Amino acid sequence: SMQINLNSTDPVPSKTPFSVSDADSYNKKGTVTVYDSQGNAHDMNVYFVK
Amino acid sequence: SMQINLNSTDPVPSKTPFSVSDADSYNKKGTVTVYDSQGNAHDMNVYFVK
């Protein structure tokens, strides 16, 4: 679960389309660490774009 | 609510009707910041013209 709050007046990103390398291509980046069957950590990166 | 003081000696502007850009076209300008449902800041300009 990821509870987030977003500012309504944030502008739409100018850099289309979404790119992992380009930070300006997304509004927000977050990270949540999940675990698999053998316990190895996967750093799920979640990108929010308007 | 808006509590303002109005002076009886203020003349009627010569450049009728009211013009937002023309300073001589209005007698008093005030600004009130309100919030909509999502809470964005809206600057209502209230103009008192005799």
Side-chain angles (χ1 to χ4, degrees), chain B:
Chain B
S1 319
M2 151 55 68
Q3 185 182 1
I4 190 174
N5 300 351
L6 287 167
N7 173 36
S8 72
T9 65
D10 305 320
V12 175
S14 60
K15 207 160 193 178
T16 56
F18 155 68
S19 166
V20 75
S21 317
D22 292 0
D24 54 355
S25 77
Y26 57 82
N27 293 87
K28 181 56 181 198
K29 171 187 170 172
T31 300
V32 49
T33 306
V34 287
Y35 303 92
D36 45 26
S37 193
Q38 292 191 265
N40 323 61
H42 293 252
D43 313 328
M44 310 304 78
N45 289 191
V46 185
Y47 303 88
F48 300 80
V49 188
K50 193 179 176 185

Side-chain angles (χ1 to χ4, degrees), chain A residues 7-9, chain B residues 38-40:
Chain A
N7 179 34
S8 75
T9 181
Chain B
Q38 292 191 265
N40 323 61

Side-chain angles (χ1 to χ4, degrees), chain A:
Chain A
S1 275
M2 207 159 173
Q3 178 185 357
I4 205 155
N5 83 7
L6 290 162
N7 179 34
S8 75
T9 181
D10 302 346
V12 199
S14 59
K15 173 46 175 62
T16 54
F18 145 67
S19 165
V20 285
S21 316
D22 291 0
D24 58 358
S25 77
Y26 54 73
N27 296 86
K28 179 45 161 313
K29 173 185 172 170
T31 303
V32 51
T33 305
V34 279
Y35 295 90
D36 62 50
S37 160
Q38 303 224 320
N40 309 304
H42 305 254
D43 42 8
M44 281 337 317
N45 288 193
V46 193
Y47 299 85
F48 293 60
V49 317
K50 241 197 106 177

